[PDB]
Design a protein around this ligand. Structure first.
Ligand SMILES: NCCN[C@]12C[C@H]3C[C@H](C[C@H](C3)C1)C2
Ligand SMILES: NCCN[C@]12C[C@H]3C[C@H](C[C@H](C3)C1)C2
Lengths: 325, 325
């Protein structure tokens, strides 16, 4: 029922957007089918964890507070696709980062994908009291993410910034807000229970879960072989401010730092291997286990303060945490 | 007073955005001064016709309807910078269209410039009744523009689309809405006189003025020498669906069309010259004078229907039309 309802609303949303282009923007059939294909390509095929989290938060708060149920569940599905379309937008912008009409069209796709989040919200929520508050929180998180991307992309320019506090600054702004905080908040807004939750504990839980997720992602990026990871690990070659790099630099010897600094940020297979060798000598995959355990305990503790005053909200945050854990 | 007040609010807006980054987003000084420089580079140096039009519409509707005056004029300046920042955003995206951190940063700049339009509106209008209606109309026009860019960029793929109705479809969506309609509407919203105007005549006037402007721009792009135009004309080489191309194809002989089709869309200086030669033989610069006269009359007529029920609104639309004429 969750995933099948999510896809049914996707069809309903795509139909509205495409017909709006045809009826109001004078779009010809050829371009409408092109945008249908582009929309399907960029928005489908993932796991929908962000979008399904909105649904899971909504179903809890209506059962643990008949016609209002159908409306709140449908809104949740629309909110979930807003975040999924937002995610599509970011991925397209990341592809560009890696008279050419294919680049013109990718740029155009990125803009349309973002605009579609506004168009679908201005339609399906036109008569909701929360439309303005929803758009403002959504836009604020999107800005947050663009700021986190700036931090990420410049973290090796101005190793001074290879610190744990700065790594958390990147993770929180670049990933945690739109991936963990925004799905929860949007489920609260469609359930009209926004002021009934402690946003401090909720923000802290989202920051922690995104941190937990990003550290595991950083370690897998370096040690998981390409065919099992789903991609080729690129953090070392790209000089990324990863959890491994910042943890290494704090426990490395002076000449190990010299060997790291001379090898980091290169595509040469042997220097990349030298970095992997350095990481293993420092027992970083052992520190990784301990670090995730500590965060996992901090997550396990903060969920209980949340349930003291917001019981039903907490079960979905546990469901979301299990998707990460 | 108009331009000096517009720049004073720019300083006030920049200060709020940068301090917000420092106080709320944990941004370090080095990156704040970088974003100050980026903001100044992309947003200043133009003519501010879009932003100053909002001011000119606002000052008319308060004098031709003490504390309310200062508020409406300040709002207008903020609305004007929203459009100017939106214009900065589009120009940066156009530059991209023409592990590289300069491309990463340009992409990031484009996203920030757009987000800043939301951040500055959610701040300075947080207590205004029109905040939601403003954001929805602004977002709709931005979507319109992305759609017009799609039409523009694909007009030579799928010469079938080299038609006058399609040229007007590009101009209207790609340029006219955000350059001519949006400044007028935003002046109406800060003056709270939105339902007091005939939006049909207003939309038609904006479409016409953007058409008038774009035809003159197309002709100058081809015949005005580079040092006098401010740039190198690129429409022929890029196979653009220009006013010259669509007007030529309707009055050309079969072999002149064959000579056009064989020469259009190339960077070879001699084929570009062959296209310019073809354009002159068809007396397109004479048809250009007649065409602009006809539109100019249609503009001169529709401004009077607008003043019948909306007198003060019409003087600013005349001021805006004079900026084009
Ligand atoms: N390397 C991935 C290429 N896939 C693309 C998917 C989508 C957005 C971009 C432009 C096209 C449509 C092709 C990137
Ligand atoms: N060809 C023009 C280069 N100017 C730039 C201005 C602004 C936006 C982009 C990235 C930098 C900051 C450099 C383009």
């Amino acid at each position: 029922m969750p995933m099948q309802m999510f896809m049914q609303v996707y069809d309903e949303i795509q139909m509205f957007l495409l017909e709006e282009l045809e009826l109001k923007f004078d779009m010809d059939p050829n371009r409408v089918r092109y945008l249908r294909k582009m929309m399907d390509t960029t928005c489908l095929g993932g796991k929908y964890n962000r979008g399904l989290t909105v649904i899971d938060v909504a179903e809890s708060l209506l059962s643990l507070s008949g016609a209002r149920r159908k409306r709140v569940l449908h809104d949740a599905c629309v909110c979930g696709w807003m975040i999924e379309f937002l995610q599509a937008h970011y991925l397209v912008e990341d592809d560009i980062m890696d008279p050419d009409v294919t680049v013109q069209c990718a740029i155009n796709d990125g803009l349309l994908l973002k605009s579609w989040t506004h168009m679908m919200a201005m339609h399906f929520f036109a008569d909701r009291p929360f439309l303005q508050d929803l758009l403002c929180r959504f836009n604020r998180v999107d800005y947050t993410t663009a700021v986190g991307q700036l931090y990420d992309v410049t973290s090796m320019f101005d190793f001074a910034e290879f610190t744990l506090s700065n790594y958390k600054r990147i993770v929180k702004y670049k990933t945690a807000y739109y991936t963990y905080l925004l799905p929860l908040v949007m489920g609260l807004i469609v359930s009209e229970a926004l002021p009934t939750v402690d946003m401090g504990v909720t923000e802290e839980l989202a920051m922690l879960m995104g941190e937990y997720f990003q550290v595991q992602d950083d370690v897998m990026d370096c040690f998981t072989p390409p065919e099992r990871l789903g991609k080729v690990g690129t953090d070392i070659q790209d000089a990324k401010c990863s959890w491994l790099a910042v943890t290494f630099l704090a426990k490395a010897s002076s000449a190990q730092v010299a060997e790291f600094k001379a090898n980091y940020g290169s595509g040469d297979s042997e220097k990349v291997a030298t970095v992997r060798r350095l990481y293993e000598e420092a027992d970083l995959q052992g520190d990784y286990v301990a670090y995730e355990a500590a965060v996992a305990e901090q997550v396990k503790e903060l969920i209980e303060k949340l349930r003291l005053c917001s019981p039903g909200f907490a079960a979905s945050v546990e469901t979301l945490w299990g998707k990460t854990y």
